[PDB]
Design a protein around this ligand. Structure first.
Ligand code: GAL
Ligand code: GAL
Ligand code: GAL
Ligand code: GAL
Ligand code: GAL
Ligand code: GAL
Ligand code: CL
Ligand code: CL
Ligand code: CL
Ligand code: CL
Ligand code: CL
Ligand code: CL
Ligand code: CL
Ligand code: CL
Ligand code: MG
Ligand code: MG
Lengths: 346, 346
């Protein structure tokens, strides 16, 4: 490679053959990726290679329901572009334009019928969407708006009953959401407020008991969360603080026992974390340090051995990596590269 | 409730809200079920209640891609019948016939497009299939044959690239298989032999690195296995023994770190098990005893806390249950009921 709260520097996925693979942007605006040779914690890595392209957003990988990876990014023309594996353990297509004019990172999820649907902000700050017309396949539909006025990147997650739901910060800095009223459809609710005051993009997970749960940095730079009180349904809970003082977006992942764990940069620029204790319904630990000096939010993912691995940019712009060991966490190691923050909303 | 190697006595699922739920048959041939109140190991259970019906196969539950449970069973007329939740956290439809004449338990899997496809043996011992025409929905297609001559219940599993693949014992007692050549299609291979000599139904998993792997009791009543050597592809490995002397079908589940674990009844009628050590690519432990006196194969499943829970019938015909603890395994507890072995092939 050539020499809102702060964003994640990469998009990551645990692939259909149990390998972690990360996607980032270099100084000349190409998308690069790096992947484990082997499905295990501490595997050697491929090194960075270029998928080319010229991007003005975070590149966002999603796995099709046939296992083919696909990467979505905004182009220098502000259209949505994508590139995909032509077969599950094979090479990549060329970049192709899906048109439109977008003003955020793209957010992607599979409908229950295997059709990817992509969400992105438009020039008037409304939310727009486009989708595959058949399972993991073009042609794509035409773009349409779900309205709203949003001031963060959008985040999408499917409910435990198959209904897509999108979250985003509003002009007032509250968290807003909107949802399919039926799976696989274009029947959507009105936008509704979940109040609060957020200063990062929202991070969304579906818990082990089927409740959507949203994490976000608050006005006070603590980590807050809120959730559906019953499976795939409102009413929502109150906003609740998980404390901390954080200087980047939060990342959240599930341990293999479904204990949630949140990661974020601290006031000392180290990686900090907090996790549920004992089980997925337990209380949260105090924030604790994983050291390092990082220049992006962290990106967390669970690997094929069931361990959380966390990636973050260093002061040198290389991507570094630390992972859970039986005892503790490993010392940071460098994967090299020279990565830039290409987020469409900063 | 009213007062090949041996089969499993129940079908089990970890539901979309993290609850285990089991389905069995009573003396009067109705399908009954029992489920955890709460998404945790050692949760209280509902007790047994009847979904009615009159069945002559194991009832087999599958979770639609919108989270609705659906149960498939052969009727006393030898047709395939089914019943489904009308909404993800709600009640059940009535039993409805999908017609045909079948001579095995049904085997079910979701295509990459969300369409359930059901496989079952016919009156000439060929394999037949029928499917939903749209994602998690009727109407259903008409029945069609994939030929072959089979002498065990069939087992289906999707490859890590979205291709369905069906396994079954042949007239010669070898393991045979057949596969989609493309996802979501009716384009299937010829039947092909994987040789060996098997004396149970095949049990199939997809490993953490995307390889199908099949377990079966051998001629010598040891547990054998065989696998794809690369992700979603032949060539297959040699048959390899995991030893043991087993008096029921094997059940296999993944620990939350992806270590495979096999369970089966022993010569002393206790539950025995063997597991991969250290990680998902590790070697297998020696067989060890979990006690009990059981009158069916075990049924294994991983719960919402990431623990394996194992169910088996007792000498009294109640369903008993034991689960992993931090240290060890819990003492057997009774869930009651009076369950019969209704398997269409014994
Ligand atoms: O040509 C449009 C492309 O759309 C992608 O989303 C799909 O994964 C590709 O297979 C191709 O159809
Ligand atoms: O808060 C009310 C709404 O909550 C949403 O999260 C849910 O998807 C809707 O179906 C409705 O329940
Ligand atoms: O460093 C201490 C902590 O590390 C976390 O990742 C893990 O979830 C906790 O169980 C505890 O081990
Ligand atoms: O009426 C046919 C039924 O087929 C089931 O497989 C489906 O889950 C039901 O919703 C219903 O369509
Ligand atoms: O053994 C040869 C075959 O093995 C199957 O398991 C696989 O699904 C096929 O695509 C082909 O590779
Ligand atoms: O009883 C001893 C064994 O129990 C198994 O279920 C588990 O996979 C092993 O890790 C070991 O604990
Ligand atoms: Cl570059
Ligand atoms: Cl707009
Ligand atoms: Cl999630
Ligand atoms: Cl930068
Ligand atoms: Cl009964
Ligand atoms: Cl037939
Ligand atoms: Cl599996
Ligand atoms: Cl019986
Ligand atoms: Mg994977
Ligand atoms: Mg579940």
């Amino acid at each position: 490679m050539q020499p809102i709260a702060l964003s994640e520097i990469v998009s990551v996925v645990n692939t259909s053959d149990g390998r972690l693979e990360v996607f980032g942007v270099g100084t000349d605006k190409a998308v690069w990726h790096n992947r484990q040779m082997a499905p295990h914690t501490g595997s050697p890595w491929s090194g960075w290679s270029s998928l080319k392209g010229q991007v003005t957003s975070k590149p966002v990988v999603y796995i099709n329901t046939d296992g083919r990876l696909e990467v979505f990014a905004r182009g220098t023309d502000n259209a949505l572009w994508h590139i995909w594996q032509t077969a599950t353990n094979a090479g990549w297509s060329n970049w192709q334009s899906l048109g439109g004019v977008i003003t955020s990172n793209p957010a992607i999820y599979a409908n229950t019928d295997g059709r990817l649907e992509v969400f992105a902000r438009g020039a008037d700050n409304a939310l727009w969407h486009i989708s595959q017309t058949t399972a993991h396949s073009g042609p794509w539909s035409s773009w349409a708006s779900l309205n709203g006025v949003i001031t963060s990147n959008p985040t999408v997650h499917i409910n435990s009953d198959g209904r897509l739901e999108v979250f985003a910060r509003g002009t007032d800095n509250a968290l807003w959401h909107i949802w399919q009223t039926a799976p696989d459809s274009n029947l959507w609710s009105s936008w509704e407020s979940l109040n609060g005051i957020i200063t990062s993009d929202p991070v969304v997970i579906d818990t082990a008991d089927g409740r959507l749960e949203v994490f976000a940095r608050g006005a006070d730079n603590a980590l807050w969360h809120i959730w559906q009180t019953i499976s795939h349904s409102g009413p929502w809970s109150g906003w609740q603080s998980l404390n901390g003082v954080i200087t980047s977006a939060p990342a959240v992942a599930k341990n293999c026992d479904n204990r949630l764990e949140a990661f974020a940069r601290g006031t000392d620029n180290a990686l900090w974390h907090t996790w549920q204790t004992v089980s997925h319904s337990g209380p949260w630990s105090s924030w604790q340090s994983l050291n390092g000096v990082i220049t992006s939010a962290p990106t967390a993912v669970r690997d094929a051995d069931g361990r959380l691995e966390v990636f973050a940019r260093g002061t040198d712009n290389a991507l570094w990596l630390t992972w859970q060991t039986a005892s503790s966490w490993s010392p940071w190691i460098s994967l090299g590269g020279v990565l830039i923050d290409a987020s469409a909303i900063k």
